[PDB]
Amino acid sequence: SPQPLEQIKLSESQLSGRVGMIEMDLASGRTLTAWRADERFPMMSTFKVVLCGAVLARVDAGDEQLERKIHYRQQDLVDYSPVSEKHLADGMTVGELCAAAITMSDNSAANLLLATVGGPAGLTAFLRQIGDNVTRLDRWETELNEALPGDARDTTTPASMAATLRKLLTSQRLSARSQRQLLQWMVDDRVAGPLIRSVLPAGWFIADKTGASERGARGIVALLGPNNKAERIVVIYLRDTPASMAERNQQIAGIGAALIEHWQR
Ligand SMILES: OC[C@H]1O[C@H](O[C@H]2[C@H](O)[C@@H](O)[C@H](OCCCCCCC3CCCCC3)O[C@@H]2CO)[C@H](O)[C@@H](O)[C@@H]1O
C-alpha cells in the first residue's frame, strides 16, 4: 500500500467523491493526518456514539439510569429495528437501547434515546456544551441519512468528530464508569467489528461505529492500534460518489491498509 495521504487521494480519484479523514492519538489528541478535516460530511449512524455520550452524561448527573426500562409501542418503530422490534411486550432498558443503537445500528433505539436528550436540538446543545461548535443533528432516524448534496443538516467534520469522541472517551467529562461503558459499546459493534477483525493482521485493536447512506456516502469512527491497544482515533467519511457500497467499503479498507503499513509517523 501507498502512504496514507497518497491512498486517500487515490480513493477520491477512483470514487469521484470527497473523502474526509483524521488520524489522532487517543491519549493526547496529536493529529497525525488531516485530509478535508474541516469539511462537512453526513454523520449517518456514526452520530449514535455521540448520542449515547449524552445519555451517559445524564446518568452521571442522576437524571437517567441505564437500568430504567422504557416501554414503547409498535407505532414508535422506524425502518431497521433488529433489536427493538423484538421487545414490544417487555420493553428495553436505556442501556440496552444504547447497546442496540451502537452495536446493531438499531434506528428505533436511537430515536427513543434521542427523545430523552431533547431530540436533535438537545443533542446539538450537548455538543455545544462540550465545546463542539460544528457538529449538528437536525433530523431523526431515518431522514438524517438522506445525504443530499450541499445540505448542512446532520453533518460533522472529521476534525470535530475526532475531538468530540476523544472528549467523551478520555477527558473526564464523563465518569470513569461511563467512559468505560462508551468504549465497550464500540468494542462490541456487531455490524462491522467482526468483519474488520477478520481482515486485520494479528495484534491490531479495533472498536468502531459505521454509517451509510444509499446516496453515495459512508463513514466510520474507529479506535485502532497495534499491540492490542486503542492507540488512535481514525475518522473517515465519504460523500458524493456514485460508486457501489462494495467499492466504498473497499476504499475505506484501503485507507486502513495504508495506515497499518505506515503506522509510525
Ligand atoms: O505488513 C503489514 C501487514 O500487511 C498485511 O496486512 C493487510 C491485511 O491482510 C489486509 O486485510 C488489511 O486490509 C485493511 C483492512 C482495513 C481494516 C480497517 C479499516 C477501517 C477501520 C480502522 C480505521 C481505518 C478504516 O491491510 C493490511 C495491511 O496491508 C499482511 O496480511 C499482514 O501479515 C502484515 O502484518
The one-letter code for the residue type at 11 is S
Name beta bridge partners: 213: 217
Residues contacting ligand 1 via CB (< 6 Å): 1, 196, 199-201, 220, 222, 224, 234, 236, 252-253, 255-257, 260-261
Q: How many residues does the chain have?
A: 265
Is residue 126 exposed (0-12), middle (13-18) or buried (19+ Cβ within 10 Å)?
buried
Q: Are 64 and 261 in contact (CB under 8 A)?
A: no
| H or E element in which residue 22 lies | strand 18-25
Is residue 127 exposed (0-12), middle (13-18) or buried (19+ Cβ within 10 Å)?
buried
Residue 168 Cα, ligand 1 centroid: separation in angstroms? 27
Range of the domain at 182: 1-265
Q: Are 117 and 126 in contact (CB under 8 A)?
A: yes
Q: Are 64 and 58 in contact (CB under 8 A)?
A: yes
Q: Are 192 and 218 in contact (CB under 8 A)?
A: no
The one-letter code for the residue type at 190 is R
Question: What resolution (Å)?
Answer: 0.9
Q: In 87-231, at which residue ranges do the beta strands (DSSP E only) sit?
A: 92-93, 155-156, 205-213, 217-225
Cell of 206: 479495533
Distance, CA of 153 to CA of 35 (rounded, Å): 21
Distances in whole angstroms, Cα of residue 206 to Cα of each of 165, 185, 252: 15, 12, 14
254 CA: nearest ligand 1 atom: 14
Q: Are 48 and 156 in contact (CB under 8 A)?
A: no
Q: Are 27 and 19 in contact (CB under 8 A)?
A: no
Give the determination technique: X-ray
Give the residue numbers annotated as catalytic, written as ranges: 45, 143
Q: Which CATH number characterizes residue 210's domain?
A: 3.40.710.10
Helix (H, G, I), strand (E, B) or coil at 219: strand
Distance, CA of 153 to CA of 151 (rounded, Å): 6
Protein residue with its CA nearest to atom 5 in ligand 1: 201
Distance, CA of 257 to CA of 199 (rounded, Å): 10
- Residues 6 or more apart whose CB falls under 8 angstroms from that of 68 comprise 93, 94
Number of H-type helices and E-type strands within the chain? 9, 9
Tally of domains within the chain: 1
Distance, CA of 164 to CA of 160 (rounded, Å): 6
Q: In what order do the strands lie in the sheet with 205-213?
A: 31-35, 18-25, 232-239, 217-225, 205-213
